[PDB]
Write an enzyme that holds these catalytic residues in place. Structure first.
Site, short mmCIF file in Angstrom:
data_model
loop_
_atom_site.label_atom_id
_atom_site.label_comp_id
_atom_site.label_asym_id
_atom_site.label_seq_id
_atom_site.Cartn_x
_atom_site.Cartn_y
_atom_site.Cartn_z
N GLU A 1 171.54 12.44 64.34
CA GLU A 1 170.53 13.48 64.04
C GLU A 1 171.07 14.59 63.13
OE1 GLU A 1 167.39 13.21 64.35
OE2 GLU A 1 167.44 11.48 65.64
N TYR B 1 163.64 20.23 67.47
CA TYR B 1 163.60 18.83 67.03
C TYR B 1 164.78 17.97 67.54
CZ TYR B 1 163.71 14.59 64.44
OH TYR B 1 163.75 13.27 64.11
N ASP C 1 159.03 16.09 62.80
CA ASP C 1 159.81 16.41 61.61
C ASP C 1 158.84 16.21 60.43
OD1 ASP C 1 159.40 13.73 61.04
OD2 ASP C 1 161.50 13.19 60.86
#
Ligand code: SF4
Length: 271
Positions: free
Chosen positions: A53, A137, A155
């Protein structure tokens, strides 16, 4: 606040099913998705998702492939990353953009080891509260992917998809709009497979529902797509689009493999 929402459960259920089945057959094979699904120790799994990520945030998928593998090779666990030097991190990070995201990932691992007993917090809120640089997120991606927590995530990719699916034209950077997208994502996220659902929504945005020339004919969600329905209605209205017509002039009824046009086979024209 009406036609921009998912009012019926049946539809939510259809959205989940279509997206997930498309995903199970079309998703790209990415080392972090593989590693994550194969890792049985939750702390290693969450760390693996965490690294991918942070890497994906300031850089394109194609390049993250190269670095991700080498990084996990060298530091397969939180503990391993916790004891690496700043200099080692910089070398493995070189080419991923802003270095501080990388330094912050290592300081995150170190904090997990030194203050949290080596345990990655198990919920999105907890993950957001404790890990430096981990926002709404990233916390949601780790929690839904690694731990199976039912938290939806938005996102750029998901936002493009949801804006089209529910035809939202208001400025997306708006506070009301973000909050609406997050609400939609939270309502859509699949309770049984929230991780795959999030990854499927993003994947759809990255592959099919692209910034330009989206592949609506291959989209698993075309039917429920408010923007798609609208253009389809316009295309019909732009051509003169209007169940046999010649036949209404019946009594004795003519044949039922459509009268011609065509007109394919030795038939016609029979003035
Ligand atoms: S039908 Fe087209 S606009 Fe709608 S979700 Fe699919 S790719 Fe996006």
């Amino acid at each position: 606040s009406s036609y921009h929402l998912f009012r019926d459960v049946a539809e939510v259920t259809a959205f989940r099913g279509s997206l997930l089945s498309w995903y199970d057959q079309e998703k790209r094979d990415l080392p972090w998705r593989r590693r994550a699904e194969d890792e049985m120790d939750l702390d290693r799994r969450a760390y693996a998702v965490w690294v991918s990520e942070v890497m994906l945030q300031q850089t394109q998928v194609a390049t993250v492939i190269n670095y991700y593998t080498g990084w996990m090779q060298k530091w397969p666990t939180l503990q391993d990353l916790a004891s690496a030097s700043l200099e080692e991190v910089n070398q493995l990070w070189a080419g991923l953009g802003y270095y501080s995201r990388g330094r912050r990932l290592q300081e995150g691992a170190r904090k997990v080891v030194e203050e949290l007993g080596g345990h990655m917090p198990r919920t999105a809120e907890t993950l957001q509260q404790l890990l430096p640089g981990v926002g709404r997120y990233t916390a949601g991606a780790i929690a839904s992917i690694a731990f199976g927590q039912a938290t939806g995530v938005v996102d750029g990719n998901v936002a493009r998809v949801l804006c089209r699916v529910r035809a939202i034209g208001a400025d997306p950077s708006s506070t009301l709009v973000s909050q609406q997208l997050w609400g939609l994502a939270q309502q859509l996220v699949d309770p049984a497979r929230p991780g795959d659902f999030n990854q499927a929504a993003m994947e759809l945005g990255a592959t099919v529902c692209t910034p330009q020339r989206p592949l609506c004919s291959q989209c698993p969600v075309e039917s429920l797509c408010r923007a798609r329905q609208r253009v389809e209605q316009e295309q019909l209205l732009a051509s003169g689009s209007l169940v046999e017509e010649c036949a209404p002039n019946t009594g004795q009824c003519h044949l039922c493999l459509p009268p011609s046009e065509p007109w394919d086979q030795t038939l016609g024209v029979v003035n």
